[PDB]
Amino acid sequence: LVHVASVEKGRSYEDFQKVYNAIALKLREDDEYDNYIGYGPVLVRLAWHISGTWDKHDNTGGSYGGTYRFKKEFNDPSNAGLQNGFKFLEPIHKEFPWISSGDLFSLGGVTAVQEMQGPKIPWRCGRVDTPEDTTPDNGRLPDADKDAGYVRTFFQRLNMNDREVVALMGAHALGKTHLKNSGYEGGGANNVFTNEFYLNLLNEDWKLEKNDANNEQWDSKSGYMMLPTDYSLIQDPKYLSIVKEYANDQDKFFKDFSKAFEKLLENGITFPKDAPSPFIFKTLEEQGL
Numbered sequence: 384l385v386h387v388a389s390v391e392k393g394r395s396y397e398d399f400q401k402v403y404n405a406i407a408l409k410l411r412e413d414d415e416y417d418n419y420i421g422y423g424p425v426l427v428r429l430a431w432h433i434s435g436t437w438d439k440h441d442n443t444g445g446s447y448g449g450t451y452r453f454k455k456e457f458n459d460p461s462n463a464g465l466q467n468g469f470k471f472l473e474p475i476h477k478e479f480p481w482i483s484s485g486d487l488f489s490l491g492g493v494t495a496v497q498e499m500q501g502p503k504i505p506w507r508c509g510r511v512d513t514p515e516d517t518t519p520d521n522g523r524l525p526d527a528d529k530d531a532g533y534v535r536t537f538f539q540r541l542n543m544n545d546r547e548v549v550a551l552m553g554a555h556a557l558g559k560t561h562l563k564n565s566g567y568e569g570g571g572a573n574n575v576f577t578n579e580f581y582l583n584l585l586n587e588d589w590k591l592e593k594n595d596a597n598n599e600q601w602d603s604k605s606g607y608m609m610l611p612t613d614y615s616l617i618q619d620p621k622y623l624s625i626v627k628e629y630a631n632d633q634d635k636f637f638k639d640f641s642k643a644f645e646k647l648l649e650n651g652i653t654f655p656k657d658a659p660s661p662f663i664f665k666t667l668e669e670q671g672l
């Protein structure tokens with residue numbers, strides 16, 4: 384299956400920067416969400432989940448078609464809680480009805496990462512909404528209760544290697560788990576993007592406990608937690624090397640996350656040779672807004 388990026392008619396960097404700005408200004412305004420975490424983390428997770436349905440074998444799923452708008456996908460148990468991100472983005476879509484759904488969802492993740500002081504993430508336009516019958520079935524997103532071998536194999540489907548998987552996982556510095564969404568509870572409640580996932584993995588005293596949903600998770604006294612799949616990055620020697628690297632080099636982590644996240648958001652998309660170059664949006668702060 385081939386999905387060719389098609390630029391929204393007549394649109395250019397300036398149009399997309401205004402969408403970015405509207406998302407960013409709303410992230411600033413709507414501060415109270417999730418006990419003052421704000422919407423940044425959930426938008427990152429949304430961008431990931433709409434992309435992470437991709438299957439490299441047949442080019443089904445992926446961000447291109449915007450299929451999260453359809454009930455089958457919206458209602459995936461793996462997507463529980465992301466409705467909050469969708470409802471955040473609805474007034475943005477109303478204001479900018481010309482942007483495709485996949486472009487909006489992926490741009491929301493870009494904007495969130497950058498506004499939370501993360502790396503710049505180059506972003507390309509041209510995802511085109513596809514029909515309801517193109518929505519992938521539930522079950523393509525990963526389980527949390529599994530080991531390193533499961534994560535490694537899982538991510539081969541999305542054409543990600545060890546370094547890319549460890550880099551992407553660093554997003555688990557953001558936000559928190561919520562028992563009623565996923566059967567996991569806790570976390571740092573952070574809304575600043577840094578390399579502290581890796582630091583926490585290496586430096587905290589972790590205890591394997593059962594939560595109130597009867598699932599195991601790793602907890603520290605400071606209030607941090609790790610899923611079994613997170614903790615697996617220090618139980619596999621290949622992953623552990625990379626965790627140590629990123630714990631010790633903020634800039635390297637930023638650069639590798641940026642590359643991996645862009646790739647995630649673009650898997651499945653064919654960009655014509657004369658497509659615009661990737662856009663790098665200015666933050667509100669950089670614009671003096």
Ligand code: HEM
Pocket residue numbers: 424425427428431463464525526527534551552554555557558559560561562564565566567610612644
């Ligand atoms: C093995 C892979 C992964 C698994 C099993 C996993 C699982 C989870 C679970 C169970 C939650 C909690 C959801 C809730 O209760 O609200 C969560 C949250 C989150 N995940 Fe992941 N995830 C994975 C990879 C990723 C990746 C690759 C990214 C993005 C680059 C991502 C970004 C996030 C973010 C930002 C949150 C916090 C959401 C919030 O605070 O509402 N995750 N993930």
